[PDB]
């Protein structure tokens, strides 16, 4: 348990210092349209990572802050800021994978490029406002230990005398929400329209290269314009050469930017989905009464919740190394650097 914690601080300050650093060398011209919120994604994971030796320490001397009042503030504020942050990003990434492959406006005023500038902004304007309360709320002091100070969420600033647990409801299911609920129903409906025009896919000609379209069809034929290849008669032939649809291949179109994006997602609701579970499941089980036992397993599992949502920080430089090929060329260029240095050290 303690030994995790501090591997993933080397992993997390190298690989996202890595991502950081490909993304800038890349020419200006050269930039993807989806590179906005990888640099973006990778600040926040960043910044995520700086919080661990203080977050580490606590946990090892048991629930102690021998840091500050400013600090336990700054720290509690970043770990959210970063965490509505990536959310957003992947938010952002599944919107620009929505505009590009699917078009729901014409090709000029789609203005891609725009809308990307624009919520890159909105994201981290967000981010900021939506965790500010935590760090208002966040103070440090003697909760039971007294010799023992603990960084903690104190309510008694905004709330009354009973509204205690209201306050901590209502700004727990709130985060939930904004953080995991809003951005993962977004990312669902942009795969979801986005599979849907996939769905039927292109047919090539390997004799002419008539490259059959199912949205145009081929009305002069008798194809109506919606017609699914494989729902075209078996009488029908090429209309540029004659030929039969057995010597038509399916268009296997390497759609590298939505492996990234899927990827990315999928891998962020396995490490999202039991910290946001567990955090709700005890906020229900103060108004719906849950039996003592069930409870007793949230409790035990939360700290475990917090070192997997941790993971994600320095999980994500492996997944580009593994499904982003632009990520895989700039790190043999990197060496390429380093050979270049080694060579005008010694000439
Ligand atoms: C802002 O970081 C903190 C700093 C110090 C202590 C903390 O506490 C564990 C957090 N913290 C908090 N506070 S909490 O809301 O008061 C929390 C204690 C809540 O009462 C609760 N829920 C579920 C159960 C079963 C019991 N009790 N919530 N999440 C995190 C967190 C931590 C690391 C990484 C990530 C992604 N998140
Ligand atoms: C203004 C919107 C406030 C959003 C609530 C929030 O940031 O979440 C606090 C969370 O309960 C802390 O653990
Ligand atoms: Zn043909």
Same mark, same amino acid.
């Given at each position: 348990?303690p030994?995790?914690?501090?591997?993933?601080?080397?992993?997390?300050?190298?690989?996202?210092?890595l991502?950081?650093?490909?993304?800038?060398?890349?020419?200006?011209? @050269?930039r993807?349209?989806?590179?906005?919120?990888?640099?973006?994604?990778?600040?926040?994971?960043?910044?995520?990572?700086?919080?661990?030796?203080?977050?580490?320490?606590?946990?090892?001397?048991?629930?102690?802050?021998?840091?500050?009042?400013?600090?336990?503030?700054?720290?509690?504020?970043?770990?959210?800021?970063?965490?509505?942050?990536?959310?957003?990003?992947?938010?952002?990434?599944?919107?620009?994978?929505?505009?590009?492959?699917?078009?729901?406006?014409?090709?000029?005023?789609?203005?891609?490029?725009?809308?990307?500038?624009?919520?890159?902004?909105?994201?981290?304007?967000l981010?900021?406002?939506?965790?500010?309360?935590?760090?208002?709320?966040?103070?440090?002091?003697?909760?039971?230990?007294t010799? @023992?100070?603990?960084?903690?969420?104190?309510?008694?600033?905004?709330?009354?005398?009973?509204?205690?647990?209201?306050?901590?409801?209502?700004?727990?299911?709130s985060?939930?929400?904004?953080?995991?609920?809003?951005?993962?129903?977004?990312?669902?409906?942009?795969?979801?329209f986005?599979?849907?025009?996939?769905?039927?896919?292109?047919?090539?000609?390997?004799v002419?290269?008539?490259?059959?379209?199912?949205?145009?069809?081929?009305?002069?034929?008798?194809?109506?314009?919606?017609?699914?290849?494989?729902?075209?008669?078996?009488?029908?032939?090429?209309?540029?050469?004659?030929?039969? @649809?057995?010597?038509?291949?399916?268009?296997?179109?390497?759609?590298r930017?939505?492996?990234?994006?899927?990827?990315?997602?999928?891998?962020?609701?396995?490490?999202?989905?039991?910290?946001?579970?567990?955090?709700?499941?005890?906020?229900?089980?103060?108004?719906?009464?849950?039996?003592?036992?069930?409870?007793?397993?949230?409790?035990?599992?939360?700290?475990?919740?917090?070192?997997?949502?941790?993971?994600?920080?320095?999980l994500?430089?492996?997944?580009?190394?593994?499904?982003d090929?632009?990520?895989?060329?700039?790190?043999?260029?990197?060496?390429?650097?380093?050979?270049?240095?080694?060579?005008?050290?010694?000439?």
């Amino acid at each position: 348990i303690p030994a995790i914690y501090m591997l993933v601080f080397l992993l997390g300050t190298t690989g996202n210092g890595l991502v950081l650093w490909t993304v800038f060398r890349s020419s200006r011209e @050269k930039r993807r349209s989806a590179d906005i919120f990888i640099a973006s994604l990778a600040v926040a994971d960043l910044t995520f990572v700086v919080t661990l030796p203080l977050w580490a320490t606590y946990t090892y001397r048991d629930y102690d802050w021998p840091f500050g009042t400013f600090f336990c503030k700054l720290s509690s504020y970043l770990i959210f800021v970063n965490m509505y942050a990536s959310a957003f990003c992947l938010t952002g990434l599944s919107f620009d994978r929505y505009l590009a492959i699917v078009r729901p406006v014409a090709n000029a005023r789609l203005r891609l490029r725009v809308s990307g500038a624009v919520a890159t902004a909105v994201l981290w304007v967000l981010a900021a406002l939506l965790a500010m309360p935590v760090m208002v709320l966040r103070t440090t002091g003697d909760l039971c230990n007294t010799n @023992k100070v603990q960084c903690y969420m104190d309510y008694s600033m905004v709330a009354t005398v009973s509204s205690e647990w209201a306050w901590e409801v209502g700004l727990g299911v709130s985060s939930t929400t904004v953080g995991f609920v809003v951005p993962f129903t977004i990312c669902l409906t942009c795969y979801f329209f986005i599979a849907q025009t996939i769905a039927m896919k292109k047919y090539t000609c390997t004799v002419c290269g008539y490259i059959y379209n199912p949205e145009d069809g081929d009305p002069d034929n008798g194809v109506n314009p919606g017609t699914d290849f494989k729902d075209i008669p078996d009488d029908w032939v090429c209309p540029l050469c004659g030929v039969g @649809k057995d010597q038509f291949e399916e268009v296997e179109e390497r759609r590298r930017l939505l492996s990234i994006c899927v990827v990315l997602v999928v891998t962020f609701a396995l490490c999202w989905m039991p910290y946001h579970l567990v955090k709700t499941l005890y906020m229900l089980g103060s108004l719906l009464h849950w039996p003592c036992d069930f409870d007793l397993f949230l409790m035990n599992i939360f700290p475990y919740c917090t070192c997997i949502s941790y993971v994600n920080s320095c999980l994500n430089p492996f997944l580009y190394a593994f499904f982003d090929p632009r990520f895989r060329q700039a790190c043999t260029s990197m060496l390429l650097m380093g050979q270049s240095r080694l060579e005008v050290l010694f000439q």
